[PDB]
Structures are given as C-alpha cells and as structure tokens.
Structure 1
Amino acid sequence: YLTHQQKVLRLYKRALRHLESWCIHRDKYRYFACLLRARFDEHKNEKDMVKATQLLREAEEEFWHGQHPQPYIFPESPGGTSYERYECYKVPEWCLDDWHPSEKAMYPDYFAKREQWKKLRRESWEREVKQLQEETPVGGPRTEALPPARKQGDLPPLWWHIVTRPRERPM
C-alpha cells in the first residue's frame, strides 16, 4: 500500500540519491537535480488518478535503467560498510542480573539506581496490562500502534525494551 501519494514520493528520494551517485560532483548533481525536479512538478497537477498511476509505471521503469550499479549507501545503514558493525559490543541489560556481588560492589551507585528502575517496571506492569486490554478491539488489534499513557505517573504500555535498548556505540 502507501497510496499513490507516498509511492511516488519514495521514487523521488530514491531517484535523487542514485543521481547524486552518478554525477559525483556536487555542482553537476545540483544542476542535474533541478532538471529532475522539473519532471516531477510537470505532472504534479495531473488530477486524473488513473493517468497519474500510468506516469509511475513508466517512471519506475525508466529508473530501473538509470540506477547506478553501485549506489552510494550511508555507512551505518543497511547494506553499508558499518551496518551491524557494533552489534557485538551491544550486550543486553539483563546480563547484569548475573554479575557476582563482588563485581557489583565496583559500581555501587549505578546498581543502586538500577534497582530503582527495576522497581518502576514491576509495579507499572499490572497497570500497563490493563490499558491494552480495555483499548483492544475484540478480535485482535488491527494495527501495530500503541496508546500513550492516559494518567499522570503512568508509563506508555510496553516501554522497557525501547527505553533500555543498548546504546548506539556502547564501547
């Protein structure tokens, strides 16, 4: 899905990046970029949805034979050089529950704060369980979204892992 509105927009970003790879130098890219913009704005006012789709059919087909064989990919993005590079250093937080007490003495203050955070999760869970139950449309939720908290001092449902996920560059 994504509707003809989004589907066309994505092509714009994807087509631009490939162009940026092909032309290499910024100046040539900028000039050749503006030409690209013109082709997009030309049919931006087409009010025939049936015709609008046909523009996309040929538009993508044109792109398929314009794509740079090696398009530039951001280093830390999927398919990039550094993608998943640091996943070895990311250790999930629950591993700290197994530390030897002698080790935990080395970091007293942090572990003390951890106990506070753990207590928050345990108490909030029962409340968090209810909130999803009542809002849930019988027959299973139809979408993957979640509802924000509806009371003071109540945390949004299912917040532990999003909050405590390992940092981007742990070490």
Structure 2
Amino acid sequence: FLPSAAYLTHQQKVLQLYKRALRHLESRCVHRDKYRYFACLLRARFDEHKNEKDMVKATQLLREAEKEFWHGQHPQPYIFPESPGGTSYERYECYKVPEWCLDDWHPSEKAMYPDYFAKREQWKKLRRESWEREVKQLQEETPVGGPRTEALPPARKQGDLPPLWWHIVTRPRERP
C-alpha cells in the first residue's frame, strides 16, 4: 500500500523488519551498552545467510523470522513523540490554519499588514498566470490512456512552476 509501485519488494520487506526489530530492541533494552551488544548480535544473525542464491528458502526464513519477532515484540514499542501513534500526532494542530483563509479579512487588518498581502497577491497572480496552459497541458499530455502511477513529472519544459504544487507548498509550518 504505497505510492511508488504495486508492492514493496523482498528487499525492503526484510529491511522494514530489520528496522522494526532494532527499534523494538531499543524499547526492550535500556542502558545503551547491552543495546549496542545485542544490536551487533542481531546484525550477525542476519549476516549468517545473507548470501543465499536461493530465494524460496530465504522467504521462508523471512516468515519464520516474523514469527520469532512477533513473539518477541514489546508492549510499548518506542514510538517517537512526533510520529502518529506517538505522543504528538499533530500536537500543535490548534494553529495549523490553511491559507485559503486570511484573505477573508476586513481591510482594516489588510491595512495592518500591508506588504505581506501585496506579495501574497502577486503569489496568487503567479498561480493563476501559469495555471491553465502549462499545468493542464502537462497533465493531459504525457501519460497512458490510464495514468497508472502516483508520481507526476516536473516542469522541465522551460520556465515556470511544476504542476499541482499549491497545497504542497502552502502548508502549515509544523510548529506555530
């Protein structure tokens, strides 16, 4: 379930397992030195049969690895206080105001902050000035009869902005 391709692969699947087991081993293991010991031990256990030219025995060892992992996880895996699941999970979302607002203000406060609204207005003219031709031509131009991907090409043509960028650029600053 991922934007790039239809699956992870074998490689990244093993990799995510290694990240999870190392993270759980943090969450199991305090004092950081025995942590470092057991981390090198775990790396050696993956080093034992890294170089199988076989594939089916490798993926079977992957499944038996997942069994001994899920038997040995932690009750509180150590989630960082910025991640979803974690302590924050858009903690300061109280002030994550989208910027389609701030133009519906009374012109007294548009007189209170003048230069900002002048440059914001030329931003919106930058948006609309290159909205129709380049962006919609680049979208209906390149792909197959079905799109069949979730990436999108840049604006390498000559000049102006890559397509469909407004709600990517204009976001909250994640600590206001």
Range of TM-score over shorter length = over 0.9
- RMSD of aligned alpha carbons: 1.3
What is the CA deviation profile of residues 72-98 of structure 1, one whole-angstrom value per residue up to 9, with x for unaligned ones? 110010111111111121000011110
Measured after TM superposition, the shift of residue 134 of structure 1 is 4.2
Output aligned runs, 1:149-160, within 5 Å: 149-160=155-166
Supply the distance in 1 between the matched residues of 2:173 and 2:114 (Cα, whole angstroms). 21
What is the CA deviation profile of residues 99-125 of structure 1, one whole-angstrom value per residue up to 9, with x for unaligned ones? 111111111011111011111100111
Contact 1:131 1:157 in 2 (8 A): no
Contact 1:92 1:166 in 2 (8 A): yes
Supply the distance in 1 between the matched residues of 2:28 and 2:82 (Cα, whole angstroms). 21
Number of aligned positions between the proteins? 170
Supply the distance in 1 between the matched residues of 2:167 and 2:135 (Cα, whole angstroms). 16
The DSSP-based 3-state class of the residue aligned with 1:11 is helix
Supply the distance in 2 between the matched residues of 1:49 and 1:82 (Cα, whole angstroms). 41
Larger relative contact order (C-alpha < 8 A, sep ≥ 6)? Answer: 2
Measured after TM superposition, the shift of residue 132 of structure 1 is 3.2
Supply the distance in 1 between the matched residues of 2:106 and 2:146 (Cα, whole angstroms). 43
Contact 2:135 2:163 in 1 (8 A): yes
Matched, 1:137 2:143: yes
Deviation larger for 76-85 or 149-158:
149-158
What is the CA deviation profile of residues 45-78 of structure 1, one whole-angstrom value per residue up to 9, with x for unaligned ones? 0111111110101001110011011111100101
Which has a greater percent of helix? 1
The DSSP-based 3-state class of the residue aligned with 2:102 is helix
Supply the distance in 2 between the matched residues of 1:90 and 1:96 (Cα, whole angstroms). 13
**Runs of 4+ residues deviating >4 angstroms:** none
Task: Structure 1: give runs of 5+ residues left out of the alignment.
Answer: none
TM-score computed with the length of structure 2 as normaliser = 0.92
